[PDB]
Design a protein around this ligand. Structure first.
Ligand SMILES: *[C@@H]1O[C@H](CO)[C@@H](O[C@@H]2O[C@H](CO)[C@@H](O)[C@H](O)[C@H]2NC(C)=O)[C@H](O)[C@H]1NC(C)=O
Ligand SMILES: *[C@@H]1O[C@H](CO)[C@@H](O[C@@H]2O[C@H](CO)[C@@H](O)[C@H](O)[C@H]2NC(C)=O)[C@H](O)[C@H]1NC(C)=O
Ligand SMILES: [Cl-]
Ligand SMILES: [Cl-]
Ligand SMILES: [Cl-]
Ligand SMILES: [Cl-]
Lengths: 650, 208, 209, 647
């Protein structure tokens, strides 16, 4: 796991080639590339939405057409084997390509992108092959009926698009595309990846400001005004492109009704209004979602720990996803078969109304929790009138989907747990509204669609412990400003009550790989956490030493006692053995001469003194995108060097 | 005093005392055929004469229609149009809106056969479910044919939905006709086999 | 031998339906007749009270008539009658027991008849603007008095608002009675002087500094 | 114009003061303080809104009861005298307490808060006397009939609360409270003024994230996570407190329908939706907004340059504030009097209807553009049925209100410019939608109430040229995410077109005062040409007496002295700490050898560093000193933020 030098070199050749462009088309190209990132991320979101809609429509039409045929004849056992096989055939195809070709495209990409924006480079995270495999794999994973979502993998897809088109070079088609030539640093590419992950969040939920605050949480740096204004531009382009194309697919072009991939609706119907006296009630919900999120993360920790040791061959972790894909169908059919309540039409509240043993004008209502998208089930657990749900079928769908969503997340498929967490939470929140509207009688403040929202926020905050960006996504996705005050209380409590037990879902899976991962602040002076065998280098260095020092310490400070003069990298020494260092930028490759590296080295590296405290050396290293920090004496003698592996330990 | 400020001129008065005769009769027909729902087939011509007598005067359209803050002749024809569209009485009528559709006249004939077979095949209700089931199946299949044919253009007509509601509620409850469905042993035998495969996979890969 | 109400109603329960059909059909007639010369709240008041009475007489076979299909004709017809009666604000006249016209609006209608017969008796409309202003002013003052009294218990009942609308349309236009209002030279003299003060202030502050 | 040290010294006494605490209550007290800042800012907004609502409602009934008394008898010039006299009598009191008592309350305090969060302390910005004069100055200048708004000076007001209750004392009344002695460190104080300015923005507009983005931009520091989350907590409690208390004041407690002082209403009306073929129409409204914002800034700059000299005694400032308020009465009366058209009083759309020369059911339509709070005018220019505005009436109203607002901004009253900018922009923006509803023949996409929204943002972005926080305020006030893309293109275009003429309004009033203000952003100029060569260094064990001579130069002000011992750098000592030592809780009580007391690890740069590398370190950490050194640690020059402002 290598780092990226987000601090720029600023050598003699950077200062010379900074001239003859100021002697301003570089700033225009950045806005052009950010507009391209927004358009391409919105179009990939449209492609996923359309293909998933049509393929899942075909599958549910085939499966429904075989249940309705076998009901009066009597062969319903052969209709279970159709849906146990149609699920196990899409998931078989969508898991061979993840286990055998690219295992970095497994799960949601949010831990990998979250480690990229700190600076850790997981080796194959932003290639084109990862984009192809993750897009087709999330399609085959959603169609094949796993208890997963599809909005989580939009962040990784958008940031892979952003790392791809910013370089202007494919490195997969063996092409050059002599157009950009300037944005091939690690200080530019990390900013473009930040804009792409923001556009991914914006198309995933319909919330551009939440995507900006997502990309500002990770990559905690100094404030850059123009960078955040480009990031906001890319997020707006992303939401607009998704909405504009999904309007002209439904054949209206005027309404623009779908800003993101999930659309919560409008929360202003005068039954939605809350009051101050139920502000304690919401706090109680934040405790319940903090307990249940800890149970989810604990049960998922003890299963990933099983799977790392015992199920790690690629053939043997394709077979596990096939069995989980068959078992979700089996448990769904068993709960559909044995249920009792039936229901007439409510105007498209089912979308595939299955009459199984009902009364010929009614339809089975356990089969409506299944056979829908989880999106439509969440949108209908909000906004429905009271009396719409039986507490037995809803509470038995809730209990089962919890364990199906907990047993599915560590699989080797492309997937996500936003929409599972929102559906687990909106279900017991809707049950909470039922018991409140039963205790108080037919009240008005006891609206179950108001408490389904607070339960979804509580469960999503308890599982994914994430507050500042998720609150803004919630407050913007419901389009009500007065709702942010209960929601951010609910997300505060669910963090606190969660963090006493277990870590957090995206953080536990960062820790379960040996990843450095600098945190927000320090949990000691610089003399304790440095590295004294530093092995510095002379300005007029006799070569032959350089090929022996280089043949683990990617950065070498340049000295001469021995006074500090600057830093040199491993890559620039190989290139010497400003457009040549950037030409050879992807994938860096007697004895007597002399090498005078006086015009290639960083002339002013950041240095901390020997007595400086740990929250001071950690503040500069985390905000400035540093990978090396020199510790000097009082006579500017270099003793010790601070890298990320020195700071990520404590 | 000039016309239209205190009173009305008698021609445009007589175009108000005529529309008043057609709304009273239409409200009477609507409530008299309200509950045994014969709505779209009894007074379609009364709705036609009201929607004709409205446009008789819309083209003194200002001496009657736009002269108050509460426009009685305007907001009452909007009631009649909203009720006629919520009923979907266009489905029970032709393209010319002059007679019943060729499909509805075949439904309401077949519905009469089913209700005259129910009350005749009766002396329990263990004889009604036999020898009468062939009528219920063809009636329900015809209904589901009409429903998708109406879906091809974009609720059915309320005159035929109420007939199908009455005969489904008369068949399912109050007669308790049902099918046996001896199918709960092979489903249990298969769904106990598939749920057993994960505890074989997790246990074989733990040992070996 | 069929069960009751499912193919065909009870015998006593369609008596209620036909009796509601008689009187909710009369009200639509009296509501279109008493519509353009707006005498709505003062003629349809005995016929609105019996339609809402017969509607409560079928609530104490309610499920046989009111809740038996997706489109409930009796319920929505009674809702139409209520939302028309609450838009006309016919409860602002008919004071408190809905049994007679209020003794603040029968005075208005008497005075309205007196104002219109004073218009048509005194008949360019030069002699109408004189000699007949005293009735119009007391009619307008009575209307504004009832209108400011109604807020403390936003529209009066449609009879008195349409009567006042008619006499405003007849006094303002078609007669063109208007006050002369020769007040524009003191207004222009006061407004030119105040607009000249910033010139004096800024100029003398520029010069003598 | 004294600087502000935002980085802690982290000296030895700091470390023993931190160890005794961490062997945790000093983090939960920040949340208690930020909750109190939110509650108090929302309550000050409630007080301002209720008092201005009741006092202006008493003035327009005296005037309507006087106009509708002389309109049939004769003698309307008395009513003009009465209205000019009431406006003069309110603005006399409202400007005699700014001009004589405390002249820093003048205007909105947004340039003073920007200079504070950028680290420059203007001598009275956070003081209880400044709060009382500004809150009662807003009320007396908004009631007094000026063309001003009350939403600007909520950002300043709440900041004055935030720096008051954190350092928990009263320097005015000399009353002490041992509650928050820890939070008196001037690192904490700039953190709380961020929370208070954010909560002021959120109670002003109903925009909590626009407040948080307002605090993040101004005060462009390193990303602090817990700070940002406390700021957002303060903004949410601010807007909830305002909404709750105004709802229990209006009656119907369970109707939380007032998040801010201006409430735009929701744009989900299904005819307010835009399309893609009217996006380059919105690019043209940004250019018109930028040109008109440049004209506003030019005319106001020449007014202010006429008013820096020639009108600078407080007495002339009071007389000028009165003569503006008497002219805005007579200009409004001459427009009301000569206006012909009048409307039949549809609903609750006038609130003081004047049947001046109209026919007993009709009330004058020009008289409702005046006689009416500008919030209600801006909200009624949005989502209104077409055919509601005569174009000559809005033409005359927009023409004279553009100049009355431009002539009122530099006065010595407490006043905002957000609401007149929104009213100008919503007014000519509605005319542009009327003229497209004429050409296209009343098409559905040419709805005039939608173009009032884009003209409003165009004019506000053209006059005051802030984006990325103005954009997010507009999305949360319209409550419509799909509008954020046209509003962003409008604001971008208006800023780009306005910047090629004249700077923004707040930047202009910042730079007319001789402040050392830093921007957000010249690699060819290294840090060798930026340092100040005369460097007076102290020693580690320096004898007392030359410390008194170094502090007693009275020919060169200095507040930072590097400690040396060749002369190799050892650290940095301040002036205030050194005055305390010449007579770490004995250093905070005085807050409004020297080896143990000096900052041991100051931030340094070598002399070959570039200026964007120096400016990135100095702005984002909030420094007031930066020691430039040689190849070894010998000191050559030092940076004290005059040198970065002068270039
Ligand atoms: C007074 O009479 C006028 C007509 O003379 C009424 O104006 C009508 O108002 C409705 C809705 O406000 C419009 O749909 C009509 O088109 C208007 N009529 C005309 C001729 O334009 C007005 O509402 C009446 N006022 C009252 C209180 O009854
Ligand atoms: C079939 O009949 C049932 C009742 O016999 C109808 O159900 C009623 O529906 C309305 C609104 O849809 C409810 O307000 C009533 O309460 C329901 N009645 C009962 C007894 O629950 C149903 O709508 C009818 N279906 C059709 C298609 O007409
Ligand atoms: Cl997801
Ligand atoms: Cl996810
Ligand atoms: Cl303002
Ligand atoms: Cl301002």
């Amino acid at each position: 796991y290598e780092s990226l030098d987000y601090d720029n070199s600023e050598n003699q050749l950077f200062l010379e080639e900074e001239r003859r462009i100021n002697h301003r088309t570089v700033e225009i190209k950045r806005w052009v590339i950010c507009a391209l990132i927004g358009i391409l991320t919105g179009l990939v979101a449209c492609f996923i939405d359309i293909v998933v809609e049509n393929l899942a429509g075909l599958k549910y039409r085939v499966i429904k057409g075989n249940i309705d045929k076998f009901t009066e004849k009597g062969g319903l056992s052969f209709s279970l084997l159709l849906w146990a096989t149609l699920n196990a055939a899409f998931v078989l195809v969508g898991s061979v390509i993840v286990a055998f070709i690219e295992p970095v495209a497994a799960g949601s990409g949010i831990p990998q992108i979250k480690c990229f924006l700190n600076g850790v480079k997981i080796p194959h995270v932003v290639r084109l092959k990862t984009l192809v495999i993750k897009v087709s794999g999330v399609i085959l994973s959603v169609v094949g009926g796993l208890a997963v979502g599809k909005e989580g993998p939009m962040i990784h897809s958008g940031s892979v698009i952003a790392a791809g088109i910013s370089q202007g070079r494919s490195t997969s088609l063996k092409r050059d595309f002599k157009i950009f030539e300037y944005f091939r640093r690690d200080t530019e590419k990390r900013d473009f990846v930040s804009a792409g992950a923001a556009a991914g969040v914006s198309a995933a939920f319909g919330a551009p400001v939440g995507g900006v605050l997502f990309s500002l949480e990770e990559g905690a740096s100094f404030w850059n005004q123009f960078l955040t204004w480009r990031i906001f531009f890319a997020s707006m382009i992303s939401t607009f492109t998704l909405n504009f194309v999904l309007s002209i697919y439904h054949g209206n072009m005027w309404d623009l009704s779908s800003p993101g991939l999930i659309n919560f609706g409008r929360f202003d119907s005068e039954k939605m209004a809350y009051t101050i006296h139920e502000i304690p009630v919401f706090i109680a919900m934040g405790v319940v979602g903090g307990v249940l999120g800890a149970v989810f993360n604990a049960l998922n920790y003890w299963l990933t720990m099983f799977r790392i040791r015992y199920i790690h061959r690629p053939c043997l972790q394709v077979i596990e996803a096939v069995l989980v894909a068959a078992v979700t169908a089996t448990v769904a059919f068993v709960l559909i078969y044995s249920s009792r309540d039936c229901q007439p039409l409510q105007g498209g509240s089912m979308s595939y109304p299955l009459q199984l043993f009902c009364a010929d004008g009614e339809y089975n209502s356990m089969a409506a929790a299944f056979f829908n998208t989880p999106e439509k089930s969440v949108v209908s657990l909000f906004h429905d009138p009271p009396g719409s749900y039986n507490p037995l079928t809803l509470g038995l769908f809730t209990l089962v989907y919890f364990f199906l969503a907990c047993w599915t997340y560590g699989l080797t498929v492309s997937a996500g747990v936003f929409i599972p967490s929102l559906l687990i939470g909106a279900a017991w929140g809707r049950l909470f509204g039922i018991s409140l509207s039963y205790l108080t009688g037919a009240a008005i403040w006891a609206d179950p669609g108001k408490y389904a929202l607070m339960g979804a926020a509580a469960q999503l905050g308890g599982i994914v412990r994430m507050t500042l960006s998720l609150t803004v996504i919630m407050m913007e996705a419901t389009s009500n400003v007065t709702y942010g005050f209960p929601i951010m209380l609910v997300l505060m409590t669910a963090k606190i009550v969660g963090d006493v037990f277990i870590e957090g879902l995206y953080d536990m899976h960062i820790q379960l790989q040996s990843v450095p991962f600098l945190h927000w602040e320090a949990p000691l002076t610089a003399r304790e956490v440095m590295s004294t065998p530093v092995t510095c280098l002379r300005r007029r260095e006799k070569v032959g030493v350089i090929v022996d020092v280089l043949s683990n310490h990617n950065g070498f400070p340049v000295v001469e006692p021995a006074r500090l003069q600057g830093l040199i990298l491993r890559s620039q020494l190989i290139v010497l053995l400003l457009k040549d260092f950037r030409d050879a930028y992807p994938r860096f490759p007697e004895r007597e001469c002399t090498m005078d590296l006086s015009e290639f080295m960083n002339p002013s590296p950041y240095t901390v003194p020997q007595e400086a405290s740990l929250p001071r050396v950690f503040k500069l290293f985390r905000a400035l995108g540093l990978r090396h920090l020199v510790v000097v004496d009082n006579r500017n003698q270099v003793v010790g060097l601070v890298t990320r592996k020195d700071l990520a330990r404590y | 005093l000039p016309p239209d400020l205190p009173d009305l001129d008698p021609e445009c008065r007589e175009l108000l005392l005529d529309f008043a005769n057609s709304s009273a009769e239409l409200t009477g027909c609507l409530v008299r055929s309200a509950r045994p729902v014969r709505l779209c087939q009894t007074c379609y011509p009364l709705f036609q004469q009201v929607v004709s007598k409205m446009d008789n005067i819309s083209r003194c359209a200002r001496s009657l229609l736009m002269a108050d803050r509460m426009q009685i002749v305007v907001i009452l024809s909007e009631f009649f149009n909203t009720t006629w569209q919520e009923a979907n009485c266009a489905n029970c009528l032709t393209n010319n809106s002059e007679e019943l559709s060729n499909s509805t006249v075949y439904f309401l004939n077949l519905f009469n056969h089913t209700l005259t077979c129910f009350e005749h095949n009766l002396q329990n209700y263990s004889e009604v479910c036999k020898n009468c089931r062939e009528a219920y199946k063809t009636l329900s299949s015809l209904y589901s044919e009409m429903q998708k044919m109406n879906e091809l253009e974009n609720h059915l007509c309320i005159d035929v939905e109420d007939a199908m509601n009455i005969t489904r509620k008369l068949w399912s409850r109050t007669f308790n006709c049902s099918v046996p469905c001896s199918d709960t042993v092979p489903v249990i035998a298969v769904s106990v086999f598939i749920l057993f495969l994960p505890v074989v996979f997790y246990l074989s890969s733990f040992l070996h």
